[PDB]
Amino acid sequence: ADKELKFLVVDKFSTMRRIVRNLLKELGFNNVEEAEDGVDALNKLQAGGYGFVISDWNMPNMDGLELLKTIRADGAMSALPVLMVTAEAKKENIIAAAQAGASGYVVKPFTAATLEEKLNKIFEKLGM
């Protein structure tokens, strides 16, 4: 994995998006773009060039599982790594996500060492 890999940070709170963007930067990942919901996110993904999507399970209009499914079915973007972000892990959320295609899942709040570890685990699983 390449430091110029372009991220899409999707979250309903601007503060949460600022926090993730800070953590990516601290890791050497500076090409980050943000979205506020699932729908907003497809709008930009559509533009192309994205490399990884980091998204919130619960967002209005188009949620985490809904956005992921949309990624997975689209010819172009179907392979994009998708990290799911949630406040509380539930077994069935984790299954739904895994089964629909999520590359990983992280419970928030998290530190940079923890995000680094999730990135490293997806990058190795993906043989990236």
Which domain CATH number covers 80? 3.40.50.2300
The whole-angstrom separation of Cα 98 and Cα 119 is 16
Q: Among 19, 123, 110, 76, which residue's Cα sits nearest to residue 34? A: 19
Instruction: Answer whether 88's CB lies under 8 Å from 57's CB.
Output: no
Residues constituting the chain: 128
Taking a C-beta distance cutoff of 8 angstroms, is the pair 87, 108 a contact?
Answer: yes
- CA of 51: how far to CAs of 78, 93, 109, in Å? 11, 24, 23
Q: What is the largest CA-CA distance in the chain?
A: 34
Q: How far is CA 96 from CA 33, 36, 37, 47, 69, in A?
A: 26, 22, 19, 27, 10
Residue 7: phi and psi, rounded to 5, are -90, 155
Q: Does the N-terminal peptide bond of residue 109 adopt cis geometry, omega within 30 degrees of 0?
A: yes
Type of residue found at 92: E
**Would the CA dihedral through 103, 86, 27, 14 be positive or negative?**
positive
The parent domain of residue 124 ranges over 1-128
The alpha carbon dihedral of 116, 68, 101, 2 has a sign of: negative
Give the CA angle between residues 9, 29, 63 to the nearest 5°: 15
Token pair of 22 as six digits: 């800070």
Coil, strand or helix at 55 = strand
- Residues 18, 43: Cα–Cα separation, whole Å: 20
Structurally, the chain folds into a number of domains equal to 1
Proportion of the chain in helix, strand, coil states, percent, rounded to 5? 45, 15, 40
User: Across-strand partners of 44?
Assistant: none
Helix (H) or strand (E) holding 79: none
